[PDB]
Amino acid sequence: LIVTQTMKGLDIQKVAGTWYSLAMAASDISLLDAQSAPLRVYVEELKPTPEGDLEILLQKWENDECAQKKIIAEKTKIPAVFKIDALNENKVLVLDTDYKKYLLFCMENSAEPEQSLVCQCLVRTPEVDDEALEKFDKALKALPMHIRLSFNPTQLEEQCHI
Amino acid sequence: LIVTQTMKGLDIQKVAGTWYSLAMAASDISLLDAQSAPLRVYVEELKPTPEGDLEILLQKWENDECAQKKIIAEKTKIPAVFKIDALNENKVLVLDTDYKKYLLFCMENSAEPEQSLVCQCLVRTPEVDDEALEKFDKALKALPMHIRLSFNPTQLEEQCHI
Which of A31, A107, B8, B62 sits 20 to 30 Å CA-CA off B36? Predict the structure, then answer.
C-alpha cells in the first residue's frame, strides 16, 4: 500500500510492442546499484497473452553477458496490477502510460514493500523523452526512492544498455 | 555550458564544521554506482584555512575499509570555485548554501567536465531535509546527471554510509 496511484482503466492490448528502459529507480541502492544488480533489468517487449496475462521480455547482465529473461505477469482484479514470481518480486503495478510514447511501472514484493520497490520509465522510441522523465520524476516524489538511473539514446539501443 | 550558477558572495569561513553527505549525483553511472566507485565520497568536515582555502575531510571506501582522506581546495579569483587535484578532479564549485543547514557543491575535471562531474547535497544534521534535497534537484535540472543517490539518517551516521 506504498504505491497508491495505479492507472485506472489500463488497456493491456495497447501497450503491446517494443519498449525501452529509459530510466529506473529503487528504494534500496544495492538492488539497482551495480551492472549485475538483481533489479537492474531492461524491458524489451511487452506481449499480452490470450489468457489476459502480460508477458514481459527483458534483458539482464549476468556473468559478463546479456541474458534474456521472460516473466509472466498474470492479471488480477485491479487492471493495472499484476502478480509475478521472479526477481524476488510478486507484483507489477502500472502507474501511467499514454501507450504511444511512454509507460511508467513499478515492481514490488508485498511482504517487504519498502525494500523491494523498483520503478522504471519505459519509452516507445530509443530517445530521451523529457515529458516522460518529468512524469517519471513526479511519480517518484511520493515514493521512498534512494537511487535513480538515467540512460542515453545510444545505451538504449545496446544490449543491456552496454 | 554545464555548471552555470555557482554561488555569488560566498563567505568560506561560515561553512566551517561538520557536514553530512545527504545526496549525491554524477554524470556517468560508473562514477558512483558502487561503494568503491572513484567519486563515491562522503564529506565529514569543512575546515577553512587562514589563507582563505578550504580543507575537506571525507570518507572513502578503499582497500576493504572506510578510509580517511583529506582535500585542500585552493582558493581562486572567484569565491565559490576552488582548485583541487584528488580523485582525479581539479575543480570544486559551491553552487549554493545557507551556511547553517545545507550546502550544494560539485567536483569536476576541467579537461573532461561531463565525464567527471559529481555533485552533492550536504546537511549540518544527520536528518533528511526534503527542502535541501529539492534545492539540490533544482540545481541538477541544468546538469547531465545519469545517476542520483540519497541516504537515510541511519546511513548518514555510519562509516561510508553503509
Answer: A107
